[PDB]
From a paper:
Both RelE1 and RelE2 are acutely toxic, very similar in sequence (∼54% identity) and were proposed to have redundant functions in M. tuberculosis.
Furthermore, we solved the crystal structure of the RelE1–RelB1 complex at 2.20 Å resolution and showed that it forms a heterotetrameric complex in which the RelB1 antitoxin likely displaces the C-terminal α-helix of the partner RelE1 toxin, and identified key residues of the catalytic region that are essential for its activity. The asymmetric unit contained a heterotetrameric RelB12RelE12 protein complex. RelB12RelE12 forms a triangular (or inverted V-shaped) complex with the RelE1 toxin molecules positioned away from each other. The RelB1 antitoxins dimerize through respective domains comprised of an N-terminal three-stranded β-sheet and the α1 helix, which then extends and wraps around cognate RelE1 toxins using helices α2, α3, and α4. Interface analysis using PISA identified salt bridges between RelE1 R50 and RelB1 D44, and RelE1 R65 and RelB1 E50, alongside RelE1 hydrophobic patches corresponding to hydrophobic faces of RelB1 α2, α3 and α4 helices, generating complementary interacting surfaces. Helix α3 of the free RelE toxin therefore appears to be displaced by helix α3 of the cognate RelB antitoxin when forming the complex, such that antitoxicity likely operates both through sequestration and deactivation of the toxin by conformational changes. While R50A, S58A, R61A had no, or little impact, the R60A, R65A, R85A, and Y89A substitutions significantly affected RelE1 toxicity, thus highlighting R60, R65, R85, and Y89 as key catalytic residues of RelE1.
Numbering used by the authors:
A (entry chain B): 6 to 89
B (entry chain D), C (entry chain C): 2 to 88
D (entry chain A): 2 to 86
Write the structure that this text describes.
């Protein structure tokens, strides 16, 4: 399975989040996402081409897949429900 | 691609496969008039999820800051992240 | 609706007209799986136009502001706007 | 516009937008909004989705007009005018 690299941005995202969502998010990131990253998420479009987004619970995980080094870079973690 | 409905009907499987394999969109034209689009499910799902990201407040700038982190190799320890939010 | 390929194939002309006039999406299935979707051209272009709006730097926050103006009836004079621009 | 003719209603927000634009771009938008747009608000724009359902957007030149077609008030409510890029 894939190596995981967690950006400082994403770590701060976890810190900002309600503790329960964060713990659920982390579990997700270290388990299922790391085995099937091309499947669990969906490629992003327009300015976000090259990135994937996965969604579950009340969290959303944006990442890049570095095949050439077998690695998942966690870019941003977001609260699903949030909206203007 | 823009294709009349009868040709789509003939090789629809080939058109669905093509649309599935690339992410090309077939604009279907009935009686010389655009009617519907054949799009890949994953392609449609891809633009609907991008909508979800762009709607999330602050997501766009947070993503740029995270890309910048990758560019600098500014990553945190996985062992610490597990610690702080597991048992 | 969710319709197998060959059935879509047999009534493609009919499904395209229905998609055209209701904007119902038809998930064409191959091997019990979602492969492609028939979607209205208007339906797709409105997804895409929403994306263009949402990626505009200040757009979501201003729209929230203008909707609050609507709720307050905080509208400006048309004759003043027209005079001030358009020479 | 006939029988129950619609009229434009420009939010404070959109006037501020118009003021923030180069005078040239602002002028054409105003021309577009009161003529073409007021006459075919359903045709010259596309309805928006997700958080923005209820709204439309029309594209022209360097500008995007985000509006609501308020049939109970017979109004085209101009909510935000933004620059295209
Ligand atoms: Cl007021």
């Amino acid at each position: 399975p894939y190596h995981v690299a967690i950006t400082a941005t994403a770590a701060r995202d976890l810190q900002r989040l309600p503790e329960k969502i964060a713990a659920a998010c982390v579990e997700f990131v270290f388990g299922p996402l790391l085995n099937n990253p091309h499947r669990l998420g969906k490629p992003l479009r327009n300015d976000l081409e090259g990135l994937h987004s996965a969604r579950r619970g009340d969290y959303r995980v944006v990442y890049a897949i570095d095949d050439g080094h077998h690695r998942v870079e966690i870019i941003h973690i977001a609260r699903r429900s949030a909206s203007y | 691609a823009v294709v009349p409905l009868g040709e789509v009907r003939n090789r629809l499987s080939e058109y669905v496969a093509e649309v599935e394999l690339t992410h090309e969109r077939i604009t279907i034209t009935r009686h010389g008039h655009p009617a519907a689009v054949l799009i890949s499910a994953d392609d449609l799902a891809s633009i609907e999820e991008t909508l979800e990201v762009l709607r999330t407040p602050g997501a766009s700038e947070a993503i740029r800051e995270g890309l910048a982190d990758v560019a600098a190799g500014r990553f945190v320890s996985n062992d610490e992240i597990r610690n702080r939010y597991t048992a």
